[PDB]
C-alpha cells in the first residue's frame, strides 16, 4: 500500500 506510505509521511512534519 503506497497510499498508506505517503499519506503517513504526509502527517509527520
Amino acid at each position, epitope marked *: *500500500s503506497k*497510499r*498508506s506510505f*505517503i*499519506e*503517513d509521511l*504526509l*502527517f*509527520n512534519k
Partner: antibody
Framework: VQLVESGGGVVQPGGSLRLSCEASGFSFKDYGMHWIRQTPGLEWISRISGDTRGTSYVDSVKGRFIVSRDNSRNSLFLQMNSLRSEDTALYYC??????????????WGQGTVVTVSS | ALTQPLSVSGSPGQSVTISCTGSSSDIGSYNFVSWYRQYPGKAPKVMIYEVNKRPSGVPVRFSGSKSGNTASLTVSGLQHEDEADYYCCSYGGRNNLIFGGGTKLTVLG
C-alpha cells in the same frame, strides 16, 4: 462496504462521550481514518494511521479528545473528554482519498449528533 | 479556512463553477484538493481529488482544476440530481486537513 457510527447524544459541558465507527466490507487496517464534524461547514478534527502508529488533532481538541482504533475488530474510536459548547456538531468518521497512489477508496459513516448542553 | 461562495445556481443543461480559495501554504502548495457532494440527510461522497482526478462512477461532467491558491469544481450539462452541497478539501500544510464552508448548488426548476 460500510462504516457504521454510534455513541453520540446530549452531553453536559465537561462531559465525556466515546464515538464508535464500525467498519465492514474492506481491509480496515490499511486506511488512515479521520473524524470530521459538521456545523453551519465541515471541520476536520483528527486522523489516525492504519497501523495506529500516528495521530493528528486540530488544536482546539488537542488535550481533550483522543483517537484510537482496534484493527482486530475493524473499529475506530473518538474518546471525547471535557466537552465544550463549541463541540456540538454532526461527527463523521471517514477514510479519505487525499493521496490516491492508485487507490481512490473514500468512505464516510452516516454521522452521529453530539450536542453539548446543560 | 477555505473559502467557498455561499451558493450558486443554473438551469438544466448549463455549466456552473464553484471556486475554493485557500492560502499559499495549502492549495498553493499541494495537489491534494478534493471535492465532496452531500445530499440532504446523507453523508459526503467524493467527486474529485488530487485537484483534477475523478473516481469512476462520478459523471464525466464533474471536473476540477486549480489556479494559484484557488481550486474550482465545474459541473457541465447540469442535471437536477446534481443539486446538493459541495465542500472542497485540501491538505492543510502541517499534518492537517482543512475544509471549505460549503456551497449550495441549485438546479433551477
Amino acid at each position: 462496504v460500510q462504516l457504521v457510527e454510534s455513541g453520540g447524544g446530549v452531553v453536559q459541558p465537561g462531559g465525556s462521550l466515546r464515538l464508535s465507527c464500525e467498519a465492514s466490507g474492506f481491509s480496515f487496517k490499511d486506511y488512515g481514518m479521520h473524524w470530521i464534524r459538521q456545523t453551519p461547514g465541515l471541520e476536520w478534527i483528527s486522523r489516525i494511521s492504519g497501523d495506529t502508529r500516528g495521530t493528528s488533532y486540530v488544536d482546539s481538541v488537542k488535550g481533550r479528545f483522543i483517537v484510537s482504533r482496534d484493527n482486530s475488530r475493524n473499529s475506530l474510536f473518538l474518546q471525547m473528554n471535557s466537552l465544550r459548547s463549541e463541540d456540538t456538531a454532526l461527527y463523521y468518521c471517514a477514510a479519505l482519498v487525499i493521496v490516491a497512489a492508485g487507490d481512490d477508496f473514500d468512505l464516510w459513516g452516516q454521522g452521529t449528533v453530539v450536542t453539548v448542553s446543560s | 479556512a477555505l473559502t467557498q461562495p455561499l451558493s450558486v445556481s443554473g438551469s438544466p443543461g448549463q455549466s456552473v463553477t464553484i471556486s475554493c480559495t485557500g492560502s499559499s501554504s495549502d492549495i498553493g502548495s499541494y495537489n491534494f484538493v478534493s471535492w465532496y457532494r452531500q445530499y440532504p440527510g446523507k453523508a459526503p461522497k467524493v467527486m474529485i481529488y488530487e485537484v483534477n482526478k475523478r473516481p469512476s462512477g462520478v459523471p464525466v461532467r464533474f471536473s476540477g482544476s486549480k489556479s494559484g491558491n484557488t481550486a474550482s469544481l465545474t459541473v457541465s450539462g447540469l442535471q437536477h440530481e446534481d443539486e446538493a452541497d459541495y465542500y472542497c478539501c485540501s491538505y492543510g500544510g502541517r499534518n492537517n486537513l482543512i475544509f471549505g464552508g460549503g456551497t449550495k448548488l441549485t438546479v433551477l426548476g
